[PDB]
């Protein structure tokens, strides 16, 4: 079952779905049940592309115990959530339809991703 889905507005990077086994999630002891990373390094879960001012590991999305998602900026050049730059190494709550934005040029072009959160997974407390 899918936790959330990530859509590109410009559309250079097709839709990506991110899932998690609900068995293995409840078996986890830690308050952070799963982590996805987004960055220039294709080792990441989501490749933001080989754009140099994008950090190799630029931000992470964390699945909380509550079933909610958190955004961790871990980047050199910053990460914007609904057009406001989040504090680096902080943990911000992701709401439905939120827009995560990173810088690509010094000219002020952007890469922009939108989170679509599957409510059926959250409610799936089986």
């Amino acid at each position: 079952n899918i936790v959330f889905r990530v859509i590109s507005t410009t559309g250079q990077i097709p839709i990506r779905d991110f899932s998690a086994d609900i068995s293995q999630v409840l078996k986890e002891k830690r308050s952070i049940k799963k982590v996805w990373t987004f960055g220039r390094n294709p080792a990441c879960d989501y490749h933001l592309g080989n754009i140099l001012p994008v950090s190799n590991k630029h931000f992470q999305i964390l699945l909380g115990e509550d079933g909610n998602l958190l955004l961790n900026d871990i980047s050199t050049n910053g990460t914007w959530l609904n057009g406001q730059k989040v504090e680096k190494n902080s943990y911000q709550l992701l709401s439905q339809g939120d827009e995560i934005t990173v810088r690509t040029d010094p000219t002020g072009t952007i890469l922009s991703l939108v989170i679509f959160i599957n409510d059926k997974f959250k409610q799936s407390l089986e």
């Binding site: 220039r40 140099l52 001012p53 994008v54 950090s55 190799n56 050199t76 050049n77 010094p106």
Partner: peptide, 6 residues
């Protein structure tokens, strides 16, 4: 393989 600033 490092990352250029603003």
């Amino acid at each position: 393989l490092p990352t250029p600033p603003l």
